[PDB]
Amino acid sequence: TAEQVAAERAARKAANKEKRAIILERNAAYQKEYETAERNIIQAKRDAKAAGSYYVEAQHKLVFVVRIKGINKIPPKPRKVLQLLRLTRINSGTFVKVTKATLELLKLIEPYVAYGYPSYSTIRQLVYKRGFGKINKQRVPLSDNAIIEANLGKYGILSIDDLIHEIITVGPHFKQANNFLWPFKLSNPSGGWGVPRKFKHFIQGGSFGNREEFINKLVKSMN
Amino acid sequence: AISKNLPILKNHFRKHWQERVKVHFDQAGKKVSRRNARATRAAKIAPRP
Amino acid sequence: KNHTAHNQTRKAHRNGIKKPKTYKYPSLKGVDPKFRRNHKHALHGTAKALAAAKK
Amino acid sequence: MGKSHGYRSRTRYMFQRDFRKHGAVHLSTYLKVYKVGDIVDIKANGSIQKGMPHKFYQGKTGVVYNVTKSSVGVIINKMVGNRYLEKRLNLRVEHIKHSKCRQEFLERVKANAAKRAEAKAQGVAVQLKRQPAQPRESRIVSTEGNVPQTLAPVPYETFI
Amino acid sequence: VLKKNPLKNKQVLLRLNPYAKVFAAEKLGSKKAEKTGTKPAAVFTETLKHD
Amino acid sequence: GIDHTSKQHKRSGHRTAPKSDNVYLKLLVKLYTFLARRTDAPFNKVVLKALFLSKINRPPVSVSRIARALKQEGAANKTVVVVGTVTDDARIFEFPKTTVAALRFTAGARAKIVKAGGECITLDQLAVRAPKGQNTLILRGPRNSREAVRHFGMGPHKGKAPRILSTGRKFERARGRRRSKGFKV
Amino acid sequence: PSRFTKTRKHRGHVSAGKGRIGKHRKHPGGRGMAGGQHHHRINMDKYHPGYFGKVGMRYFHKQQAHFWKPVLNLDKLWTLIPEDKRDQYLKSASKETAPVIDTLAAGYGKILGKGRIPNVPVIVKARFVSKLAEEKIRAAGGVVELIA
RNA sequence: AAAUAUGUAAGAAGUCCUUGUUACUUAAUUGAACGUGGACAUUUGAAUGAAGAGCUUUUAGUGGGCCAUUUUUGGUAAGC
RNA sequence: GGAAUACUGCCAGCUGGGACUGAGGACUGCGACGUAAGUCAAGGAUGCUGGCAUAAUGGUUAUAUGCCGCCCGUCUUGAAACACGGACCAAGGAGUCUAACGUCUAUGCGAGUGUUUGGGUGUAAAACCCAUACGCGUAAUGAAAGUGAACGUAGGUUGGGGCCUCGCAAGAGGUGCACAAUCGACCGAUCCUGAUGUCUUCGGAUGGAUUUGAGUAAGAGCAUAGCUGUUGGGACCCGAAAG
RNA sequence: GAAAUUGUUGAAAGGGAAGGGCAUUUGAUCAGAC
Ligand SMILES: [Mg+2]
Ligand SMILES: [Mg+2]
Ligand SMILES: [Mg+2]
Ligand SMILES: [Mg+2]
Ligand SMILES: [Mg+2]
Ligand SMILES: [Mg+2]
Ligand SMILES: [Mg+2]
Ligand SMILES: [Mg+2]
Ligand SMILES: [Mg+2]
Ligand SMILES: [Mg+2]
Ligand SMILES: [Mg+2]
Ligand SMILES: [Mg+2]
Ligand SMILES: [Mg+2]
Ligand SMILES: [Mg+2]
Ligand SMILES: [Mg+2]
Ligand SMILES: [Mg+2]
Ligand SMILES: [Mg+2]
Ligand SMILES: [Mg+2]
Ligand SMILES: [Mg+2]
Ligand SMILES: [Mg+2]
Ligand SMILES: [Mg+2]
Ligand SMILES: [Mg+2]
Ligand SMILES: [Mg+2]
Ligand SMILES: [Mg+2]
Ligand SMILES: [Mg+2]
Ligand SMILES: [Mg+2]
Ligand SMILES: [Mg+2]
C-alpha cells in the first residue's frame, strides 16, 4: 500500500533516458569510425598509385559460412567438423574468425559449405532480422536492448549496435558475442542459386567453396 | 539352460508329483471336529478330567 | 561368412570410447616393497609429528 | 598350415638395427635418471632380449610409476573394444627415452613464471597464452628497379 | 507475443537505435565526397597498357 | 532434417514426486515444495528431495550415530534432522540432551531420547521452528551396507560374494577356488 | 492380478515379444543344468567358481545338537538384565552386591569380546569364554564363572 | 623415402621458496616419497564446441546378412 | 582537355499493385510525436455496410471427372510372384497355475521379526485373542581339531552436500553425514622366528609376512504384496518315425 | 431370430475385372441454429 506509481516510475524513466544518451553517443562514435576507415583505405590506394607502387590491402579477418548440403551420406570427419561449427541443418549460417586452425577446418568441410567475406550491410541486416540470443539454453529474439545489456553487459556490450560492432571489428570478446548469438536459420535464395548444379566449386561454375565477395549477394537473397 | 547370474536351485519335481498333492482345506472343519470330540469325551467320563 | 569387421567401429562409438578415471593417491601395490614399507613408516611419523606440533 | 600368433610375429623390420648402428650401445643410455611421473617413449632394441616390450607398444608414450634396479614401470592406455584399459609394462632402460615435449613444456613454464614476475616488477600485465597464426597486414610494394615482367603460357614443343 | 521486424516498422527501429533519427535527419547515407586530384603514374599506366 | 547431437525426448533420471500413497507424506511434500520455492535456503531443497526417496535409499539412523555426530566441535547445540527412521542402540550407555526431528521413531528410540532429556519433533514442527533451516545438521544412514551390495559386480578376481542358497564345505569351495583343484580364480 | 501383466499388452502383435527370427522353442540348450562342463562353461566359471570337485573329509551320522554354541559379544551383555533393574545396577553396584547373569538360561554358549562395557563389576556364568572377553570382564572388575 | 591413417603434451592433482617424517638410500648434514608454513586468479597458460556431468543395478531381441566407390588374394575368367 | 553514360556497390530515400494469416483477451513493458495534458502504425484486428434466415452454407450418401493406387499373412539378403496358407459366414481357439529364487517398488514393525502346526472363542470354513518352541537376522574363518573382531575422539590424507562465524556480497575461516580414492589397525587360515615353564612332551608366550577370507571398524533385518527375469513341472498352442 | 447365401420392388453405374486416396460437380437425404 505504498505510493508505487510515481517514485519508481520516475526513477525507471530517468535511468532509461541515461542509457539512451549513452547508446546515442557510442553509435555516433561508431559511425565516424567506420567512415574514417573506409576513406583512409581509398586514399591509401590512390596515394600508392600516385607514388608508383601498389598498396596491398590487409587480409580478411572474418568469414561467414553457410551450410549447403543436407544431412544424409556425410563421412565422419566432415560430419564432426560441421557439428563443431554448429551447422546442423541446411541453410544454417555462422560467423568464423580467420586463423590457421579455422582455415584447416574450412579446408576439411569445403564441399558442403559456401563461405565468404561479409560486409557491414549484410551483418547489420542479418542481426536486425534474424538475430536470436541464447539465454538459459533457450532461443530468445533480441527485439530490445535490455536483453543484450543483461547478458552481454559483463563485456561492456549494451546495445545491438555494440554487438554488431564487436562482430564487424573482431574484438577482444568475439568468442563470447559470437557464441551468444544463436546460429542463423536462413531460407532458400529468392532468385535461385545462379547455376544449374550447385555441388561443384564456385570456380567450376557451382556453389561451394570461397566466393569471397558474392557471399553478400547470396546471403542477402537468402535473408 | 544356465544364464544370467543367479543361485543354483534344487527343486525336486521330476516324478509324478501331481498325484500326491495334499491341500489342507479342512483345517477349520477338523478343528470343529476335535472340539466336539473333546466335549463328548468330557461328558462321557465326567467328573474325571 | 567367416569374418568381417563391418559395423564394429560404429558399435564402439555408440556409447563412446572412454578414458578411465585417474585419482590422486594411486595404489601402491605393484610398487617396490622396500619403498612401500618405508613409506608406511614415514607416513606414521609425519602424522605423529603433525599431531604433536600442529595443535 | 595354420596361422601363428607368437610373441614376436610380424616383427621383421621392427626389431632390426639401423644402417651402421649395430654392436653395443653408448653409455648415456645407462647414465640417465628416471623419476616417478616422467614421460617416456618406447622404442625397442633388438640387441637386448631381456626386458623387451611387445610389438604393440612400439612408438607409444607413457608415465613412469615404478623404479627398480635395472628397470622402469610404465603405464600405457590400450583400446580394447569400447573402452581403454591401463597396462603396466616393466621394461629395461635400454628400450626407453625421455620425451622432448615435456622438456619444452617445462621450459615454457619457467619462461612464463619469469615473464609474469618481470611484468609485475615493471608494473604491467602481459598476456601469456600462445596465439595461432594470424592474417597479414597492409603494406606497400615499391617498383624501384622492380618493374613487373609479363609472363605468358608456353606452346607445346616449338621451343623444345 | 509477435516478432516485429526492424528495417520495416520505424517504431521498432527507433526503439532499438536512437541514432537512426539523426541519421535520417542529416541524410548520412547519401554522403557527398570531397574531390581529390591525385594522378596515376606513368609507370602504372605503361605497365597496365602494354608491359 | 536436423543432424542431431543427442537423444531427443530424454527424461531426467530423477524422481520428482513420492511413489507412496501416504497422504501425510504428500502434505509434507506440499509444505516443503512451497518453502523451497518461496525461500532462499538451500536446506529446504535438500529436505524436499530427500522426501522423494525409496526405502533402500533412506536407511535407518541409530541413536549412537546421532550421539557421535553431536560430539562434533561446536555442534553440541544443533538440531538433528533425519528424513527416515531413528532406531535404538544398546551399545551406547550415555545420551545427551538434544532436539531430533524425524519422520519416524521406534519406541525404544523415543523412550531413550525423552528419558535423556530431549524432544522428538516432526518435520512440520521443524518447519515452524526454523523455516530456513537455522542451526540444523542433516544425517544419512549407511547406504552400501545392505546384503544385496555384497553381490553387485561379480566376476573373476573381484572379491564379491556369490549368489548362493546353502553354505558349507561342499558348496562352491572346489575347482575354481583352489590351486590343487585346477586353478584359483 | 492378470490385468496388470504384459500378456494383455502383447495382444495383437504376432510373436508375443519372443522375436520373429528366433521362434521361441521348448528347451534351447538342454533341461536343468545340462552342459555345465561343455557349452555352459563360461557362465559356470564366471558366476559359480568352486562348483565341481570334492574338498574335505566326510562325517557319517552328523548330529547338529553337538555343535550348539550361540555367541554373545561383550557390548550386548547388559541387555540380559531387565530394564527396570538395569539403571539401579548401573548406578548402585559395588563388589558386594554385583548382579549375576546366567547366559545359558538366556541361550548362549560362548562369550566373545567385541566392544566395551562400563566399569561395573558383574558375575558371568557361561560354558565357554574367550581370552579377551575374560580379560575385559576382570578389568571392569568382575569374574567369569564356568558352568557345565 | 611421401600422402593418408597413428601415440603423447599444451598446468591449481601447477610452479617457486623454506624446512618436517622414514625402519629406504648416500661417505655425509646426500637423496627419494609424502608433508607444514609462505607467494602466485582482469589470460589459470593454443583454437572451436559442449544438447547437463558422473555413477550403479537389471533385463529384451540378435549371433543366416547383402550392395556400391576405392585398395587387393586365388582361379583364362564369371552375377566365381 | 573538359565531361557524360555504362558496370558494381550503399541509403536508418519515397511510392503504386497482388496474395495468405488475425494467435492473444482488464492494467502493467519498451518507445515515438508534442513546452504538457494527451495522441500513436509502440508486448498479435478493428471500423462501416449489404443480402439471406433456409436445405442457402455444411454434413452424409450414390455416382461422374482429373491424377495416383499390384493380394493379404509368413520365412528370407531379396515377395505382385510361376515360394507356402487362404471358396464364404458364425461360434470356439494359443505365455497359464504352482514350489523355490534374483533385481526393483509399496507397507508394517525394527536388533529384531513372523498370530492362522496347535489352543481359546464365535453372529460359525469368516472375524477376534494366545503360550512354548521354531525359521531367518544380529560373527567370521578353517578340510578339520579349533580359535574368534577398539593402540587411538572406532585412526591419518584427498575431495564432499548442508550447517556455523565474519565481510553489504562473490569471498575467507570452522565443522564436515552419505559416498569415492588411498595408507594403517583388529579377527580367522597359511608361512617364517621360535622364550620363561612343564607328568620334559606337552604347553606357544612373543615378533613378523610383495600371502589368504564370501570378515571387524556406533548394527539392517524380518514379514506381506506387486511387475519383470529364472529352473522343474503337459509349461504358449498343434505335429513324428519309435519304445 | 444375426451373418454367409437368395427372391421381389425402387434408385444408379457398366466399349476386355471390381474395389481404394485427394478434390469438387450433379442427384437424393439430413441435424443444429437464429
Ligand atoms: Mg536446377
Ligand atoms: Mg556367422
Ligand atoms: Mg549400417
Ligand atoms: Mg632367457
Ligand atoms: Mg521379451
Ligand atoms: Mg568341453
Ligand atoms: Mg564352526
Ligand atoms: Mg603449501
Ligand atoms: Mg546371446
Ligand atoms: Mg538363425
Ligand atoms: Mg483474437
Ligand atoms: Mg446438400
Ligand atoms: Mg455444396
Ligand atoms: Mg453432395
Ligand atoms: Mg498407377
Ligand atoms: Mg508378401
Ligand atoms: Mg499360392
Ligand atoms: Mg490352396
Ligand atoms: Mg479353412
Ligand atoms: Mg578411512
Ligand atoms: Mg590376515
Ligand atoms: Mg560395518
Ligand atoms: Mg505340448
Ligand atoms: Mg514357470
Ligand atoms: Mg503327440
Ligand atoms: Mg529304445
Ligand atoms: Mg443377408
Side-chain angles (χ1 to χ4, degrees), chain A residues 76-89:
Chain A
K77 194 168 287 199
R79 180 150 50 153
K80 175 77 173 159
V81 175
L82 287 158
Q83 267 155 9
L84 290 169
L85 287 191
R86 305 192 289 170
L87 306 176
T88 51
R89 68 169 97 211

Side-chain angles (χ1 to χ4, degrees), chain A residues 20 23-24 27-28 31-32 35 39 43 46-47 49-54 124-125 128-132 141-145 159-160, chain E residues 3-7 12-23 28 31 33 37 40-44 47-48:
Chain A
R20 278 191 86 81
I23 288 176
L24 186 80
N27 286 351
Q31 217 283 316
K32 190 181 171 81
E35 64 167 359
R39 284 282 112 195
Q43 272 306 106
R46 286 166 177 180
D47 282 344
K49 261 206 294 172
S53 309
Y54 305 97
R124 188 181 158 264
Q125 280 181 334
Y128 269 33
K129 201 192 157 204
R130 307 215 173 237
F132 285 80
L142 301 184
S143 82
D144 190 49
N145 283 312
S159 67
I160 188 177
Chain E
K3 171 77 168 65
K4 291 189 175 189
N5 191 30
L7 308 166
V12 180
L13 177 77
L14 261 292
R15 181 214 288 165
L16 270 158
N17 204 3
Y19 188 68
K21 179 183 178 299
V22 302
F23 198 100
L28 259 294
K31 172 65 77 73
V43 51
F44 174 74
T47 62
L48 176 128

Side-chain angles (χ1 to χ4, degrees), chain D residues 104-126 128-130:
Chain D
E104 272 108 12
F105 166 69
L106 290 170
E107 289 155 18
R108 208 174 94 227
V109 160
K110 301 290 180 296
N112 277 358
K115 276 183 237 164
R116 184 187 258 121
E118 181 252 319
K120 190 57 73 79
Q122 215 276 318
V124 78
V126 75
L128 253 55
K129 292 194 164 79
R130 318 174 276 172

